Design a protein around this ligand. Structure first.
Ligand code: B4P
Lengths: 113, 115
């Protein structure tokens, strides 16, 4: 599952505040939250960046968004939220394991960085 | 109507002009009129979904397709240094047009936090 810190989290080698898990993804609170609610949804398959995602992983990527949607509702984000995928240096990608960030609990501003 | 009542539905049906990047049976990619980065485009489903919070479980493939199309368009547009994908939901998310859209921003260093 990869040699990043997110791979270690998936393997339960280091702790994280887990929100949801299934057979193909994991959702957990971000260690550096930028909003009152800030969590990540990651695939268990090690896709390093969205730019290299294959066509066969189309529904898996959508699964991350559906899981993010359901976790946001369970966490009470009834006023809205923002989902973010960072790619590469210009995108500010901090870990080379694809992650969908979900931020809410405050007004999110424009531009988004 | 196919596409919905919003301005994005009218773009889908060619009723209002747009600068189209990619089009298939499931989605449409086009440039944002108010760019927040040197390159800033949107990927929308042709099926009207008002917001991500009301997406159905069976919309999984469609939502993932928006992301795949977004990354393919970003590569075709030469965003080799990277980019940021953004889905705004509701008032706190900054959503104004209630037709789901995935925004792709690149061509400059994006900052943290993402708004
Ligand atoms: N033809 C087009 N082609 C390509 N890209 C396009 C496009 N049109 C939009 N886009 C882009 O799509 C992206 C995402 O869409 P959004 O960000 O969700 O929508 P917006 O165009 O940015 O509207 P705005 O943020 O300016 O809200 P407003 O001040 O008018 O008003 C503030 C709030 O008050 C609401 N409001 C309006 N009238 C009201 C009224 N009488 N009473 C109460 N509220 C009202 C509004 O719904 C709004 O939410 C944007 O980046 C946008 O540039």
């Amino acid at each position: 599952g990869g040699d990043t810190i997110f791979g270690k989290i998936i393997r339960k080698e280091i702790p994280a505040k887990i929100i949801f898990e299934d057979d193909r993804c994991l959702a957990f609170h971000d260690i550096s939250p930028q909003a009152p609610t800030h969590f990540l949804v990651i695939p268990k398959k090690h896709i390093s960046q969205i730019s290299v995602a294959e066509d066969d992983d189309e529904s898996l990527l959508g699964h991350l968004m559906i899981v993010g949607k359901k976790c946001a509702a369970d966490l009470g984000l009834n006023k809205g939220y923002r989902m973010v995928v960072n790619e590469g240096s210009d995108g500010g990608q901090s870990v080379y394991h694809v992650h969908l960030a979900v931020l809410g609990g405050r007004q999110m501003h424009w531009p988004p960085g």
